[PDB]
């Protein structure tokens, strides 16, 4: 009778396990097993060793990762792992020759580097260093300069500046190597006129002066970085001391004004595809370039320059989606929102058509969630079609010859088990592993492409599945309210032995930004998990409007105006909730972090009178201290000559007075570089200066996660002591 | 039956009446009076109009201050007054002519003056703006560039650099006129190795950017400023383009490494004194310097050098006291410790004499305060020697000639009301005001110095008294217990209707810095009062050692070891009071702030579970930390060398773990310049690192002071309900 305990949470006692593969070919993988890496042979479960408990113990216990060259000759040891960032970060690495079976020490690669990739095919390597990029054709040779403008925080080569890794790319990287790696193309970033933002850094308290960390970071309005992308020729570095990078420029309808570098898809060696988007994301255009042998130039004629719009708000869900090319590269698929605004597959061909360009291959009121395999004959994608729940994912084909023959992958399987699938096909899709993250316990297991038979299966966490036996697990509920004529979907953790006909306290947990999905079918073991199993808390989590993966109309309804209707039906589903009976209404919470702290904060200074407490954890009090790319993308530019009203009608200071009638709880992080301190700092002095009493916790030295594992205990301690506060437990 | 509520103190409803007058002459003062300033005849109540409810009004309501040439010919209006650290500031000037009835509007005053001041005689003016002094010989004349090196943050003329004003002469000031204006003398700080600390500065919620603060701040053992002192001919300005200010450079004895200027004090037109120290304070020197008409150059020789040393810990309670010179200036008086640790007046001569260099007038188990006047025969001071109460203050009178009249001229005015006073005597001593803080409401009258006769009452809280007749007023008791053969004061703060079989809730208000003085006979109105008469908890202070003015003995009994003899002191005392019956073991609290906050924490992190909670407020958490000052005077320098071991073994963090037996809540100002945010920001991870739940508050844009209005009144809220959780009331 022993229950899910916050130590349970934290201290992480109930493992829930993955299968997490690498394919090396259309029919093998590799397996990481008791520190061993393993090659297996899909189709038999037939495996055998291919790197050693050792060789990983050379480097101590500092090897953070390892990469193995695609012709399986080498393998990259990755070591000295210093995060920056939320993707960025510097390691050390070294080389092991598999074959002559020993690390390779010559020509060794940098003590810092920021960035290292393997060619597509052989054993090339490009690395950043010191902001330059470099290249090996081998791992015994000695690296080629590439660039030599590199410097820090004004020149990046190869790798994104801080707002294009994280509202771009989402990865540090600015590297692409093209197939046969004859090519290798690169971004290269300009922070010169981005203003600069700093957070002081105590470090040991042995520190006497603490440091100041300085960072260019665009804030909505400010001056942007700028992009150049270039194309340097490999085969050449031997005979030259220098190679000149051919550069691509942006197309003309871009180039009048501020733009980014939308997305980089190598097509073939001859041709590479290279998206843009305006400052304001509501235009993009996706250009195909093809190179030129006898004048040894990229062009990307107009004639093969496609366009995306939006009269609803933005271009894609967080930007436009990637194109997906046929061998030949004659045509491609890509997501885009049908004429309903719903996000399905489309055919283009390489030359744009008037007003024709897409051929729709997927129709219905649910959307394609991702493109996962082109194949001669077939497209593997996923999608949240199946009984029609948004917050469900399966695997589904389309035989190319016939738009008919599609088949759903997933579906049977274990309709009582998983309902959210992940997948990862072989080299050409021989095989196809599926990960069942599904309401139940995750299950793993490969199939055989060709027939859908499951081979074996991976991994069922029998293991978790046996220990969470002797403990009271809540349940989880995924159902759905209607509101106008429309449905939304929520999710409710609801205590062990949960009795409708009781009361019971409710805590709505928070994110809703922009095409977000908090109410899913995915299994999971966090600190709701713990807040019903031994609290009795109710623990929902509503997709309003401007969420998720269910059509434009609800997505693109909170543009230009954040603060609005995202808030507004977050309280709307609380009043629900209470209708249905089992809730309390003398105790409701909310707490939210990042674009989750910014609604909780918003919600609680609504003066709804519908909540008792809520807890903000770094969050965004007014846009206009936020990053350009995020904020500008759904506010447009903090101007009177666009929206400048907007910007300043949601602010969370201009509702302090509305607190006054709340119990809050703000948390910020003393080293966030994403959500700068400022913004809680901005609320605070704002109640103050209302005379609202409230709590506050700052963590030093934190970033925006507040992650660190002492800091992540003390936090998730804190709130759980502030909760049992408000709602008269402890 | 109404009690002093928490909004009484907040909103200052019971307004406590001063009477602060300036002494204009030896039988005349001014006094504001309904935004008037009056001219008072001493000896007859009859007035006199000097400045009109009018003038102060042109500036709108800016009218910061004001100031009147010695000469009552004119006034310095001052406005647009901007605080920066405890006493810089800018603000703007306009000169007012009295006699010509108008502000003068010729030669303008800078309008970002950093400091200005009226000569000791005429009409003179001198003031400081972008680091560079001018002078002006009279208000319609334009001014005379002085110095030309100043330059932010980097040279100072004039006025001193951040830690000369915060630890050495406690203002901005670094001018010095001399008697008859000929002489204008100055010093010239160089900030030049000094590290820079930085904070950030959030300012309006429309500031996109936060702002940075750089302050050349050296913390313990780092480069300090270097000083100059110069001496500038004012007589010669109308005939010259540029004065050359001839320098006086300090004694041997201090030159041969770091050092400071201790006090600067005209002795006549032609004499100077000056006080000098070294890095670590236990050797000081005042050197007495001449000036020779025929080289037109200072001397000070050795001969005229006076050496003020200490065995047991540094110089001073802060520092040197000031030398009091006699007319002819041949000799002078100044308060010193005797032979037996208690700070005494005694009697100098201008040379110096071999190990007889003083003559004491002035003995016993007591300390003179200080100096308040000397005349031709007789010499005003103050003490605590009356019913041997260190805690209280008395004006007092030893006649020059037979140093046995001796006589003490408040003692008996109101030995019930007043034990606390402070003075105020004319020009030449022909009057004298009282101000008694003492026990009861503070009271104000003058006396006619020759036989003491009170010729009228000036204020007397009688307003104030109607008022507190209808509310339930706590007690003070201030008494001393005796530990180890000793005594050592407390007071203590006690509700209302005071049942001495009843129990209490104590709160211990501490601070305990080196001389410092909790435990007095001072009436006060603060959050205590409140505390008392509403929450009826009991608020003591004590004075334990390292404390007060009780001899070198107590004071230097923590000398090279803060947060040790001073804390333990502060948890006996506890004991004690426990002991004493009428307080409930089961909820006993500390709080302090600064170096009060810094003991508050060591106390709660000394595991001696007598305490329940406590509060620090911008507390310091390691004297590495702290500026060099300050901190070496009772510290050392943290060398190997010196005294590193207890700098490292006095840390607040290093005492994590006894926390987890504490309800602990750290509040800190985002702006404090003087105790730096890392201070907090270091207890804090220490114990997230130790994983201890505590509570934290920063404040938005807040000095070391948080006393902006909504901050000061929402800190306090704040406090009184943490206080209620704590003590189970609220
Ligand atoms: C691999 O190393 C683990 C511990 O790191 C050890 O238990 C195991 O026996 C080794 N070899 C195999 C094949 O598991
Ligand atoms: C894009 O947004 C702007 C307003 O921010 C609007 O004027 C323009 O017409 C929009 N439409 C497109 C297709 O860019
Ligand atoms: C439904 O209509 C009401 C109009 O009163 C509006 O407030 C609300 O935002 C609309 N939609 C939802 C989901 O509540
Ligand atoms: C009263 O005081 C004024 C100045 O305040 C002085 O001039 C005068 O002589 C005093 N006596 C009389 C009777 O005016
Ligand atoms: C001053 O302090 C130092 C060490 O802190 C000591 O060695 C010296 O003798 C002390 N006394 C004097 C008069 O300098
Ligand atoms: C008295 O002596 C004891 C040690 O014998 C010590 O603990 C205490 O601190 C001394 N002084 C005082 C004021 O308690
Ligand atoms: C199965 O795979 C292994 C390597 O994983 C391969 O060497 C072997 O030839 C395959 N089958 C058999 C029967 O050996
Ligand atoms: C990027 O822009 C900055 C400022 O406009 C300029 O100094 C820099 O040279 C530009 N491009 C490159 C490749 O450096
Ligand atoms: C001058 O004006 C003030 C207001 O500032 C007023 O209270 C007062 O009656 C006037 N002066 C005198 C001496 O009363
Ligand atoms: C003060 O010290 C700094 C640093 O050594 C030096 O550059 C400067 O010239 C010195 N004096 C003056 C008057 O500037």
């Not at 403008?149 to 020149?155: C, M, P, Y």
């Not at 401007?546 to 709307?572: C, F, P, W």
């Not at 003398?586 to 989750?596: F, H, N």
Request: with cysteine; glycine share 6%.
């Amino acid at each position: 009778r022993r229950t899910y305990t916050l130590a349970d949470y934290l201290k992480n006692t109930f493992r829930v396990k993955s299968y997490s593969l690498r394919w090396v070919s259309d029919s093998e993988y590799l397996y990481k097993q008791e520190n061993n890496i393993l090659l297996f042979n899909a189709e038999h479960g037939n495996s055998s060793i291919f790197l050693e408990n050792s060789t990983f113990e050379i480097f101590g216990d500092s090897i953070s990762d390892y990469s193995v060259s695609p012709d399986r000759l080498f393998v990259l040891l990755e070591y000295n792992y210093v995060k920056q960032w939320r993707h960025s970060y510097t390691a050390s690495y070294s080389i092991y020759d598999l074959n002559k079976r020993q690390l390779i020490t010559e020509e060794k690669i940098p003590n810092n580097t920021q960035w290292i990739t393997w060619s597509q095919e052989g054993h090339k390597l490009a690395y950043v260093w010191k902001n330059d990029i470099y290249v090996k054709i081998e791992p015994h040779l000695p690296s080629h300069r590439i660039t030599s403008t590199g410097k820090e925080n004004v020149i990046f080569n190869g790798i994104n500046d801080w707002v294009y890794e994280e509202e771009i790319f989402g990865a540090y990287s600015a590297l692409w190597w093209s197939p046969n790696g004859t090519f290798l193309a690169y971004a290269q970033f300009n922070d010169t006129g981005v203003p600069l933002i700093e957070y002081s850094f105590y470090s040991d308290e042995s520190l006497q002066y603490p440091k100041t960390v300085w960072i260019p970071y665009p804030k909505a309005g400010a001056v942007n970085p700028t992009v150049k992308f270039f194309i340097v020729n490999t085969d050449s570095l031997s005979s030259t001391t220098t190679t000149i990078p051919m550069q691509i420029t942006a197309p003309a309808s871009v180039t009048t004004g501020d733009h980014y570098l939308c997305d980089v898809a190598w097509v073939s060696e001859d041709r590479i595809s290279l998206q843009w988007l305006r400052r304001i994301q509501n235009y993009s255009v996706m250009a195909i370039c093809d190179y030129d042998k006898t004048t040894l130039v990229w062009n990307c004629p107009t004639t093969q320059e496609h366009i995306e719009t939006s009269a609803t708000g933005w271009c894609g869900r967080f930007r436009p989606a990637e194109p997906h090319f046929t061998s030949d590269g004659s045509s491609f698929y890509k997501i885009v929102s049908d004429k309903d605004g719903y996000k399905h597959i489309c055919q283009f061909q390489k030359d744009r058509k008037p007003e024709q360009v897409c051929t729709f291959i997927t129709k219905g009121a649910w959307e394609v969630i991702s493109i996962e395999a082109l194949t001669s004959d077939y497209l593997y994608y996923i999608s949240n079609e199946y009984k029609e729940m948004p917050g469900g994912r399966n695997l589904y084909k389309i035989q190319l010859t016939d738009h008919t023959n599609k088949k759903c992958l997933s579906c049977d399987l274990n309709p009582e088990r998983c309902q959210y699938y992940s997948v990862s096909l072989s080299k050409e899709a021989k095989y196809y592993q599926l990960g069942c993250r599904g309401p139940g316990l995750p299950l793993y297991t490969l199939h055989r492409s060709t027939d859908q038979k499951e081979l074996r299966v991976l991994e069922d966490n029998s293991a978790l599945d046996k220990m969470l036996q002797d403990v009271q697990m809540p349940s989880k509920k995924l159902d759905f309210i209607v509101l106008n004529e429309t449905r939304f979907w929520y999710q409710m953790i609801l205590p062990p032995h949960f009795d409708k006909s009781k009361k019971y306290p409710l805590l709505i947990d928070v994110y809703a930004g922009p095409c977000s999905q908090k109410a899913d079918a995915a299994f999971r073991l966090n600190w709701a998990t713990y807040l019903a199993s031994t609290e009795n808390i109710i623990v929902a989590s509503f997709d309003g409007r401007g969420s998720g993966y269910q059509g434009d109309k609800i997505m693109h309804a909170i543009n230009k105006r954040l603060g609005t209707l995202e808030v507004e039906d977050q309280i709307e589903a609380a009043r629900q909730f209470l209708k249905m009976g089992f809730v309390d209404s003398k105790r409701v919470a909310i707490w939210g972090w990042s674009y989750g702290g910014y609604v909780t904060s918003m919600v609680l200074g609504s003066g709804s009178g519908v909540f008792k407490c809520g807890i903000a954890v770094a969050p965004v009090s007014r846009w206009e201290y936020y990053d350009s790319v995020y904020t500008e993308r759904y506010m447009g530019l903090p101007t009177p000559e666009d929206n400048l009203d907007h910007y300043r009608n949601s602010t969370v200071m201009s509702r302090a007075e509305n607190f006054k009638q709340v119990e809050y709880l703000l948390i910020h992080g003393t080293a966030d570089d994403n959500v700068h301190f400022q913004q809680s700092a901005q609320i605070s002095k704002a109640l103050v200066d209302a005379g609202v009493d409230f709590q506050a916790m700052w963590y030093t030295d934190e970033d925006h996660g507040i992650a660190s594992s002492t800091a992540h205990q003390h936090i998730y301690s804190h709130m759980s002591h502030f909760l049992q506060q408000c709602f008269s437990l402890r």
